[PDB]
Amino acid sequence: AASXDXSLVEVHXXVFIVPPXILQAVVSIATTRXDDXDSAAASIPMVPGWVLKQVXGSQAGSFLAIVMGGGDLEVILIXLAGYQESSIXASRSLAASMXTTAIPSDLWGNXAXSNAAFSSXEFSSXAGSVPLGFTFXEAGAKEXVIKGQITXQAXAFSLAXLXKLISAMXNAXFPAGDXXXXVADIXDSHGILXXVNYTDAXIKMGIIFGSGVNAAYWCDSTXIADAADAGXXGGAGXMXVCCXQDSFRKAFPSLPQIXYXXTLNXXSPXAXKTFEKNSXAKNXGQSLRDVLMXYKXXGQXHXXXAXDFXAANVENSSYPAKIQKLPHFDLRXXXDLFXGDQGIAXKTXMKXVVRRXLFLIAAYAFRLVVCXIXAICQKKGYSSGHIAAXGSXRDYSGFSXNSATXNXNIYGWPQSAXXSKPIXITPAIDGEGAAXXVIXSIASSQXXXAXXSAXXA
Template identity: 30%
Template structure:
């Protein structure tokens, strides 16, 4: 099948006869300020590669480049029943994934609302609640019981340090959680202990990040998938590197893990260019950064966050009445028709800038790993809902790689469910390694 890539986004055409000349002049200045040229994209991508390498070095860098301890590629032939859970800020999702073995799977899921007090409960209360939800789910899905413990992958989207796939020491709570007795502890045995209290046959075999899950789930169904991506309120990427090319793991790898073994890397590249060396920050970006909860951090993420401009671009009305309401209700500003037209064009330009900047991470990983063709599996609210994102991102990749062929050899495609299916597939890969007596983490002293 020939893939020609997405077509360029359609721009709203309208008359600017009622727009004062001084506004049009200022608009032109701002458009020039927000334009990301192909030369700038290439410069950013080259620096991105440098920062990815720094993150893998012993010294480290702005981008954490966290080894995910997924040491095998999914083949698509994995089979069996696996559980996954995803602990979010408002609910717990429990998923049963039946791997078909022909790059296919079926899922059944339930969501359990987190009681408000749970985010400030005790450690036992939280993990006992999760265990009770798991028991209810398993009893419903397997009324006659199971013949062997069900392997479980735990999607834990909170800062945690991992020395193996089946452990994760919580560094700090986020998303409104503030539960005593968990920070600084491994959450896997805490959950396993609660599961054993309710006597449900489940073994927690893997703790994962959702971006790594997106990578693995998409590779299971698509042999051309090379990376998992999240474009939402945050941005992130995951890909497979090679153990021997990760200097910070030198001396820590067990003897049974080959130097050529793949290793999933969770980049956490929202922190790219915190030193402000290449990103074309405007005075407005600097102001947003200063007024943010963490000034000087997550610079890249802040520049591609487009939640407010997206609302402007989504206005379907010719008179932009939704934009008028948005500015009136959220900012207390009354706008004229002429001002709204300018606002609309600027929102489109900000969206274009965001899309073009966001693909620098994709291009950097492709160049670093030598990928000449790839499916880059993406998820998140910006990718799924932002008007024109996919088309603008595709054009950005063309501007960097300057392909001569009519087809785009590197394309962004919709991802599979990372926090559900991805966690389950990683559980399958991990269980296989454990059964074979293979290591799933650093050397044990």
């Protein structure tokens, strides 16, 4: 705004500004890291989605899904029919308090009721004995599905007295009140490899963009180092290892983690999830707030004001991106948002320090995002492809052309559009309740011809 200011901005365009060279030394270590578990050990997660088959697109039947985390749980049944899906859902809001609880006894004691008021309303019973699938975006330590045991608590969630098969757990309430079959407990990260691989033949990935960023790509059972149990496993071809790049580079020897990047941690549940705490959709709005805070003290802006805004993480993700979506420009929506929130008033020189941060914060978290979709696709050498990318983060101020345009950075693609663009990140088909239906539809299948489904009994 004001040269003086115009200098304070400068420097966080340094902080919060992420380039190729950075991106590319990050992409080249992401390999290591990526190849690292697969092996015997590894600081970066890597659990299959335990999906050994390859959606045939002509697969068909009745299934179920549900997507649990966020604030709402959904239900959907479907009928595949020649590369086409036909689900029906909804669900109910993480009924206020769903963090601190304990128990599938309360948290697990509702997804039913929930399923309850479903059925009875659509089918009003059913003739066959329906099958099912239910995703765990929390702690994945997948060894099958019907499996799904906790690896490490998370998602931003809390229904404690969980951290155990916080998964195969639900089920039990299934039979308890009952009526069905939980065939799999997965991740949504693949339901985009899988369900959209169904829908889209050239689909190379399953990457998702939220509170947690992540992705999943198909290795070849001979890439994995899970290869000490097989038999009926194609012996080398098709296998959807569940990535979980959330845990990417905390040995911290490579992510450009700036200086606020260090905060969120210490003050937070600490020293956790580096590549998402620095690439994520849900922790960013707050970053705003560590910076805005720091300039509040060397007294750069809010020239006098009241900070009740200092609530140690008092504001979210929608905020900083609304500052960005900021329609007019003189930035009056920002003027609103703050007033009556923490109600501050600073000058368009202020809304201009704020709208800028909110930028880099974006461009680097997105730009920084896709510095993955490439480390993999290189590790596996894809030349071309698509990527079903999915996450609210993808309905966030100017962002899809970063991941995208940003990829060309790592890569270097000198072409017309993304479209025209050598590797294109396209939106994926329903990955949390869809990948679901079709991930099960393959599960069952594989079973019969008593083929195989987990790490050898």
